[PDB]
């Protein structure tokens, strides 16, 4: 029941092993490898979107 995933290494130059030991999901370690984002709801939060080269309020 082991899971293998890559480590946080640098660029231009791994594979740790994890087994869960407790019956509950509140015992698991922190999910410190989710690096995704989406600033489309804070920047650009408008109807009838803008095309960045048009005068846009033309």
């Amino acid at each position: 029941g082991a899971q293998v995933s890559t480590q946080k290494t640098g660029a231009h130059e791994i594979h740790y092993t994890n087994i869960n030991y407790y019956k509950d999901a509140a015992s698991n370690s922190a999910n410190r490898q989710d690096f995704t984002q989406d600033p489309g709801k804070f920047t650009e939060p408008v109807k009838d979107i803008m095309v960045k080269s048009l005068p846009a309020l033309n």
Binding site: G40, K41, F42, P45, D48, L57, N58
Partner: protein
Amino acid sequence: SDRVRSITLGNSTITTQESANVVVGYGVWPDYLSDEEATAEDQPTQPDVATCRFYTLDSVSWMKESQGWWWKFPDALRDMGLFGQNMQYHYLGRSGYTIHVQCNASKFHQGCLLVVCVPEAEMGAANINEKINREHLSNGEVANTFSGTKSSNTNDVQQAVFNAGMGVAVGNLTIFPHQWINLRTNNCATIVMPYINSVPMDNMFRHYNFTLMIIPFAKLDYAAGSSTYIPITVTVAPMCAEYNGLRLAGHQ
């Protein structure tokens, strides 16, 4: 051009000719509550024409020394038709909104408003270990007013523009769904605001969902022959309003 916008909700229509755009929340458009996110078990009430329509609040006067204004918004519509009646007869409410603010001038007037729509604007007190009365947080369709300096009234909100009643930097208050009314380009500011809460439905008297704030950064200024009286008019329309838990009328 895209400066002309028309909005129809019910038997009420707003036509504008110097609009800017429409900000829609955090990208989410107001919709009804699905069966997976539901908690209550009985049939809701969806009036959809007699409720979802534009209501016009009081106009406020904008002098050269004006500081700002706020309205609490599930409570400013307490006495506005069948929306307010449906608030009075049910226990659980849930709606989104459309906030349209009118202010006009000429090409010789200058000024710049910031229209913010802030969720959970829990406000501070003028005296720190003192309880605020409900007539100062909200007054219905009548606006409450910020002050320029440190206010110290009894049972009142700390009224200073540079802390917005919340203890934050007023310049950083643009993280929320906002627009500007700049008097050389704009005439109006439309903000579509969805339902934001920690629970799927809530009571519309015990809770304050959000707070509209209209704060003039660039102060109003004009010459010695121009018009002095410049009003500011707020119009609100509930969207996808539904109601749950019918019982007798009251709030206690």
